[PDB]
Amino acid sequence: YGFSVPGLYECNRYPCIKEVECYVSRPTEKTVFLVFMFAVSGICVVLNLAELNHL
Amino acid sequence: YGFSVPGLYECNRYPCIKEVECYVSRPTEKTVFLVFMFAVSGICVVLNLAELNHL
């Protein structure tokens, strides 16, 4: 997923005629959610690594 | 106009997004009309050239 959800998508898959433009719903909220989840997962990874180092 | 009216047209002019496909109305009849008019004009040109040569 990368780090952001773009508001525009360029889609060139059948049956679409050549290349078409599609518009995503509430991309900013999904981007915020994605970044927040990545941060939480990173915090979990850091804590688990600290526990492993302690072991 | 060339010699034929294609049934499909590829259009990339604003406000169309990038490139789109458009469909022509009764292209075969228009192609027949175009070829017939070209033939008639050619006959007229040949007759005029013959008259000029006679002069």
Swiss-Prot record, chains A, B:
Highly expressed in neurons. It comes from the Eukaryota. The chain crosses the membrane at residues 33-55. It is found in: Cell membrane; Cell junction, Gap junction. Residues 1-32 are extracellular. One gap junction consists of a cluster of closely packed pairs of transmembrane channels, the connexons, through which materials of low MW diffuse from one cell to a neighboring cell. Belongs to the connexin family. Delta-type subfamily. A connexon is composed of a hexamer of connexins. This is Gap junction delta-2 protein. It comes from Homo sapiens. The chain holds residues 221 to 275 of 321 of the full protein.
